[PDB]
Amino acid sequence: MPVTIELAVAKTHKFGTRESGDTVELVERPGGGFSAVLVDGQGSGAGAKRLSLLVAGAAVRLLNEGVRDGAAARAAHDFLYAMRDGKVSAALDILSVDLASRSVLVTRNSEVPMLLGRNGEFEQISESGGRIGIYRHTRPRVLEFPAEPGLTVILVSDGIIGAGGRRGQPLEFLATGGRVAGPETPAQAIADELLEAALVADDGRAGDDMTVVVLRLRNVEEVEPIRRMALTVPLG
């Protein structure tokens, strides 16, 4: 069947800082479809943000050129490894729906778990290639799923996994994801609600930058092929 892609993001910064070192960039693939690049750079605040932007940018450039996701992740690593002399790490994920291969690809270098929903049944997946920027020969670990209606992917930054840690009551990630992801729940509502649960776990003072990325594939129930995108930034 034809598929509709919903992607959504909800994110905030560590309490006490004025910006996040987590970057999510969205890029249109020249073969059709889209990618989200999630980078969580070492550190917080201004410097962390500058570097996460450039790391994301290294991957986004290559994706724009139709370079394959794995190669793009390796390039982002090579960039960070060269520019910071093997001293700074970052978590990197690339989450793609490739409308030419009819596939969802997840290229992971993060050491944070993800959730996968298969028609409402969620599981936690710990497979990743670990962080980029430090080991010379770092490689992504890769997941590929047929792009069918009912597939959901939830990717987070470590600030979500860390929520509650301050008071020794860590967020139960898999349990909270399955809870919030109802059958008709839109991607944005999953992302919003997972982030809110993490914020409640940190008593409203994020202990680290927090980012939730949700992909939901569903059946087509809009007849005109309209593409939409929206960004909201409160408190600019």
Added chain:
Amino acid sequence: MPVTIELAVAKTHKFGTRESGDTVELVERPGGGFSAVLVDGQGSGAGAKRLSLLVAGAAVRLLNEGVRDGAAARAAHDFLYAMRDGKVSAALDILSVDLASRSVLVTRNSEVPMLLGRNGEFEQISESGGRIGIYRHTRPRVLEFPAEPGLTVILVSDGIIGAGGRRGQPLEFLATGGRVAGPETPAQAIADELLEAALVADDGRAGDDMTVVVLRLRNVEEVEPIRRMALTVPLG
């Protein structure tokens, strides 16, 4: 005053084609804030889309690197002029919220009117540099406005302006914009309703790719700096 920023896009393609030649890409600005890059490649279909992705990708790269918006537009022009040997053109606009300068910039090489909302009313503005790609000495025109509550910018592709040509009754752009953009209307609803007005004017058969980009700055009504992004698109 502090502002909450909404950016929304609604877009579809020319009837009888399978893809749009118009591209919108979003990029986070290193100095703080973001840019939307709108490109309408010459013609329609896959050729036009290749061209517009090529230009948009260049402009995103430059803005990610911190190249100032007017310089970025000229460099995107230099890139197209080189890659296609001076033979092909594109309409380009860059719409930026610069959170370091507290301003909204519109860098124009499109030759398509825009709408500007302020003082509780709308105006149509045609100031622009030429299309990019062909003329060696192309330069952007840059409009800047303070980033304050109550500011709206609506950018469109020429398929919106030309809607209603077939039936003899062109879409009334300013009247429609003012009608659909009431004080409390969200950016996505404005984008959607203007797109639909254009589709209706073309009797449900889009005469040329149609893209609506809406930026709305509003008073802060929220308390947590939680950024949200959403993309909804066919795979298909």
